[PDB]
Amino acid sequence: AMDQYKLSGVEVSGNLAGHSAEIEQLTKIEPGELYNGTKVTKMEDDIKKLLGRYGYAYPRVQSMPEINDADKTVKLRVNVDAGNRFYVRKIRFEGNDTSKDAVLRREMRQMEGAWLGSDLVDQGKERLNRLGFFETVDTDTQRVPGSPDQVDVVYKVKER
Description:
Helix content is 26%, strand content 35%. It is an alpha/beta fold and 160 residues long.
């Protein structure tokens, strides 16, 4: 296997949605960093999370090791596809048995008709968590059928 080799670099290409600089930062190598499958998926996951902050809800990242035996190093060839950028059509609430939807909507930071922003969906979640009513608060981003660029954000809530 390759867990003993050193990462010589990460070469990224594809459709980066204008975020090549940030994706380069994420992609830089650490001192004496070894090749590792797990850190590779963690890297793919970090890239998707980043693009998600910009409304690219379903981005792809594939990556392929190029072993160089002369150097005992491995280079990561990486393809990024940001995919469609989504805006929010509807924000929806569930589990919501005591309080009018108004009580939750009022805490949103992600607005209908705006570009989707995972951090915005998250802030909504923390504002929800923070008023005590709920045991759990989870979010789901659902594509609107027939739509290439619309999602609904569902806040699934469970009261105490």
